[PDB]
């Protein structure tokens, strides 16, 4: 059904010690597959499906553009610094571009850029023009709308980006379509007259999950605290959900976990030890 | 723009079992951050640093993971250094 | 496939 492609890119002045200044990270359905860095200077695989099913020509081809982009984005640091009237310091440039496809056909085509954590330029596919947010984005706006860069980006987001994403999904249909059980553990702590109940899901795939605390059948999201969905090293996901309650009402509270891997929502009551 | 740090384990923590200690920081700028996994105040051996990425709101995120075995009595914490924090923040981890 | 960058 829905398949998303995203290319996260970062250009840094202060990496700082023993770290690469230029990093290009790729994503397929919210999962890391490709990576590029200023020290290695080569595009390397991160998943099994992209390493085997993709040709050697693809790796040498992506590296050619990758090395070229690194040299272009190197001068881009200085271009902004001279425009903003900056001598130096900690400054970073961010890039976010990709496509979202639904049942084959594309539904989204974005190209966004930011400087020092603030929106700089954003491409509009409909009007074929680059939107300026900061008054320092007008020279970039006049530069790209002048040549064939606007036409080339529109051709990429509608053809090149769409055609290749269909292949990436076909290559990793088993690794993206898989489902893993989270393994839920419940623990409670006694503080200054307040009982803090914790619900933890360790390793689940895909990323979306619904972990909420229930009191006497009714869902309580008013007092419940959540740290969102955090990723793991292997490729799976983790989540942290807590709730503050009065001591003695441990039987009334139940943690419900809703996931694609489970056919029915898993209930987890807090049974203590007291030993 | 202060980093939101969450320290957790890959599998449910048990005594004398092979587990991975994860330290994730989200919502920080500048991207320069010093995250180190500690065991009783001393840094852990064999620490792997996951590739740096950022969310839709241009806020950076990074993960630090290492293979370990939890022992009773030994305290596990995460030391995070950032330009906005002004002082190094220590995040304690609970096994149970 | 990555898109080629241009000077600002």
Numbering used by the authors:
A (entry chain A): 1 to 275
B (entry chain B): 2 to 97
C (entry chain C): 1 to 8
What does the paper say about this structure?
In contrast, chicken TAP genes are highly polymorphic, with each haplotype encoding a TAP molecule with a peptide-translocation specificity matching the peptide-binding specificity of the dominantly expressed class I molecule encoded by the BF2 gene, with the BF1 gene expressed poorly or not at all. In this paper, we find that two other haplotypes known to confer resistance to Marek's disease also have low cell surface expression and promiscuous peptide motifs, and examine the structural basis for promiscuous binding in three low expressing molecules.
The heavy chain BF2*0201 refolded with β2m and the appropriate peptide migrates as a native monomer, whereas refolded with the inappropriate or no peptide migrates in the same position as heavy chain alone. All of the other B2 peptides have generally smaller hydrophobic amino acids at P2 and somewhat larger hydrophobic amino acids at Pc. Crystal structures with two of these peptides, YPYLGPNTL and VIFPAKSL, show that Pro and Ile at peptide position P2 and Leu at Pc bind shallow hydrophobic pockets, similar to the way in which anchor residues bind pockets B and F in many mammalian class I molecules. This mode of binding is completely different from BF2*2101 that remodels the binding site, despite the fact that BF2*0201 shares Asp24 and Arg9 with BF2*2101. Structures of BF2*0201 and BF2*1401 show promiscuous binding via hydrophobic binding pockets for the anchor residues at peptide position P2 and Pc, with the class I residues at positions 24 and 9 playing supporting roles, and with residues lining the pockets explaining the relative size of anchor residues. The differences in pocket sizes are primarily due to difference in size between Val43(45) and Tyr43(45) for pocket B and between Asp113(116) and Met113(116) for pocket F, which are supported by a network of hydrogen bonds from Thr24 and Gln9 in BF2*1401 and from Asp24 and Arg9 in BF2*0201. In BF2*0201 and BF2*1401, the two Ser residues are replaced by the large residues Asn69(70) and Tyr97(99), creating a constricted groove much more like narrow grooves found in high expressing fastidious molecules such as BF2*0401.
